[model samples]
Target chain A: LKNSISDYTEAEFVQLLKEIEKENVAATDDVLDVLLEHFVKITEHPDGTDLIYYPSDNRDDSPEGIVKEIKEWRAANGKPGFKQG
Target chain B: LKNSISDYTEAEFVQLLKEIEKENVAATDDVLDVLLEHFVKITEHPDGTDLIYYPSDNRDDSPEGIVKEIKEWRAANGKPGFKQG
Candidate 1:
C-alpha cells in the first residue's frame, strides 16, 4: 500500500494534488483519506522531521504547504461546476 | 492559533471529533484545518516519534488512529441530519 504511494516522486505528488484541485473535486473523506495516507507515508522520516509540505517550515513537498492555501485557491478559482441550486 | 489548538486536552480532542461525526458535519477545509492543526500540535513530540494515533502503529491518539477508521465510522453511522431535501 505504502509502496504504491512511495512510488510517486515528490513532483508527481504535487502534480496529483494540483490536478485534484484543478478539477475542483470535493474534499470527501475518501479523498482526504487517500491523501492523508499518502502524505503521512511520504512525510514520515527517520529524523523525527517531515518531508512533505509543512507550513511550520519552508517545506514545499506539496504544491502548497498548508491546506488553507488549497481552500483559498478553490474559493478564488471557483469549482467550475460545483455550484448547485 | 496553535495555542488555542494546544489548549484542548486529548480527551477533548477525541470528544470533539466524535461530536463532529455524530453531527455528520461535512468535513470541510475549515473543519479539517482545525483538526489537522490540533492533531499536528498534539502529536508532535521531540522523540522523533508521534504522540497522536497512527494506524501504522497501535497508537490511539485520536478517536481513530487512521483517517480510514473515521470514514468507516461515518459510513456506518449515517449523518443524522445531513441529507439534503
Candidate 2:
C-alpha cells in the first residue's frame, strides 16, 4: 500500500483528520494516538518527532498536522469529560 | 481490516513473533512496542496490557505470548549492544 503517512499529501491528511474526528467520540482519540505512534515508528527520529509536529513546509497534511487540527477541532467542538456522554 | 491483533490465533501469533524477531535487530523492539501499544488501544484495559503478557489461559499465541518468547529467544540468541555489528 502507501509507503507511510509521510508519503501522504496535505489534502489526504485533511480528509483523514475529518474521518478520524467523525468517528465515535471515544474512538477518535485511539486513532489519533495510533497515528502519532506510527509517525515515530516509521521516522525513527532517535531525537524526536518535532518535524511531525512542525513540518518545514508548514503544511497540515502531515501526521501531526492532522493530529493538531483534530485536537483544536475537538476542543472547540467537543465536550470535555472523563466519561463522555 | 483484521479487527485487531487480538483477533490473531496463537499459531498466527507465533509466526508473527518469529517474523518480528527476525527483523533487523534494531527494528525488533519497535514492532514489539507497537504491538504492546496496540494491545492497550484495542483492549482499553485502562489498567494495562498485563493480560496480553499473562493471559489467563497462558497460551503463547497471545500478544504478549510472542513478545515474551521473542525476549527469551533474543536473550538466548541475540547480543546486547548500543551499536550493533
Candidate 3:
C-alpha cells in the first residue's frame, strides 16, 4: 500500500536510515517496503509514479535502489554493519 | 558468505532477534543475510549442511524462512513494529 516517500519529515526519514546504517542491516525489498510505507503516510496522496520514481540521479531511484544506496553510504562512511535483532 | 547459526551463544542469538522484534523491522533476505552471518561466525565448522537446513517443524528451516518465522513471532507477541532508526 505504500505509494510514496513524502509523508515522513526529513528528520524522521534520516533517522530511520541512520538506524539501518548503524546496524549495518542489509537492503532488502521487505525492509524497503516498510520505509516506503513511511513515505506514503507522510506524502500528499502519493501515487504510483511517486512510489516507483525518484528525482535523484546520484544513486538508484527505485525503492530497492534507494535502500541499496543507503547501505553503500553506510559502508563508505565506515559505519558498523548490520546485526539484526 | 553466511554458513550457519551455531556460532552465537543462545543469549546473543536471542538478543539479536529481540532487536528485530522491538523495531518491527521487516524480514527481508538481506536482513536475514546478516543474521545468517552471525550464525556462521559462532557455529563450529559450519558448512552447507548447517547453512541450508534447520531442525524446526513449526516454521521454515531455510535461512529466509527462519527470518520470516521471527517476524511472525514478533507480530504474534504484540511487539513494536520495525522503525528504521
Candidate 4:
C-alpha cells in the first residue's frame, strides 16, 4: 500500500550497489529477474526480527546480508544452544 | 498493522524456495522451529522491516529466510571497509 524500501532508499542503495558492481557481479537479467521478481517474496513474512543483521537489500544479489544472519544466529543460539535457554 | 512482506508474497516465496532447495543441505528441527515461528511480533521492534525473512517456515525449524535478511542488511548499511565489507 505504501512506498517500498526500494522507493525511498533507491539512491542510497544504488550507491551502495556500486561496491558489488564488479564485472564478475554484473546485474544480469537472471540476477535482476531473481532480485526484482523475488524481492517482495523474500520479504513476504515481514517479520520484525527475522533478519535483523541484514539490510532491506542493496541489489546485486549480494548475500553478505544472508551470511551475517547465519553468524549472528549461531553466536546467540550457540551460547546455551538456543531455545533451551 | 505488521502484515510484513510475508502476508502478501508467501505463495511466490514457497515456489521460489522449492526451486532453490538443495539435497546436500540438511535443515534440522532447529531450522524448522525458526521458520514455523513465521514472523509477527518483532522481538526487536513492531514496525518497519526486520529481515522478516523467515522463509515463512516450512516443516523443519530451519532459519533459511532469516539468513537472507541479516546478510542483506550487512551490505545495505555498510559501516565501510571495516567489517570485511
* Candidate whose DockQ is highest: 3
What does DockQ give for each predicted structure? 0.03, 0.02, 0.06, 0.02
lDDT of 4 by residue, B1-85 (tens): 1233333233333322322222112233454343334433221223222333333343232333543443354347552211221
**lDDT by residue for model 3 (A1-85), tens:** 2233333333334445444332334434576666555544443232422434543566565334544554454467665323333
Model 3 reproduces a share of the real contacts of 0.00
Task: Fill in the DockQ of model 2.
Answer: 0.02
Instruction: List model 1 lDDT by residue over A1-85, tens digit each.
Output: 2354335443444545553332222324466456555545444423212333334454444453533343343357552211121
The TM-scores of all predictions, comma-separated, are 0.25, 0.22, 0.22, 0.17
lDDT of 2 by residue, A1-85 (tens): 1355445444444444333333313323676576556545543444234544445465565444644543443357553311121
Q: List the residue pairs that clash in candidate 1.
A: none
DockQ for candidate 3, please give it.
Answer: 0.06
* Model 4 misplaced regions, further than 4 Å: A1-85, B1-7, B15-27, B39-85
RMSD of 2: 16.1
lDDT of 3 by residue, B1-85 (tens): 2233323333334446444332334434566566555544433222422433543576565334544554454467665323332
Global lDDT of each candidate: 0.40, 0.43, 0.43, 0.33
Model 2 error, position B48 (Å): 3.1
Tens digit of per-residue lDDT, candidate 2, span B45-68 = 333545443454545554445445
The pairs that clash in candidate 2 are A10-A61
Best of the two (3, 4) by lDDT: 3
Evaluation by lDDT, superior candidate among 1 and 2:
2
TM-score of chain A of each: 0.38, 0.31, 0.31, 0.23
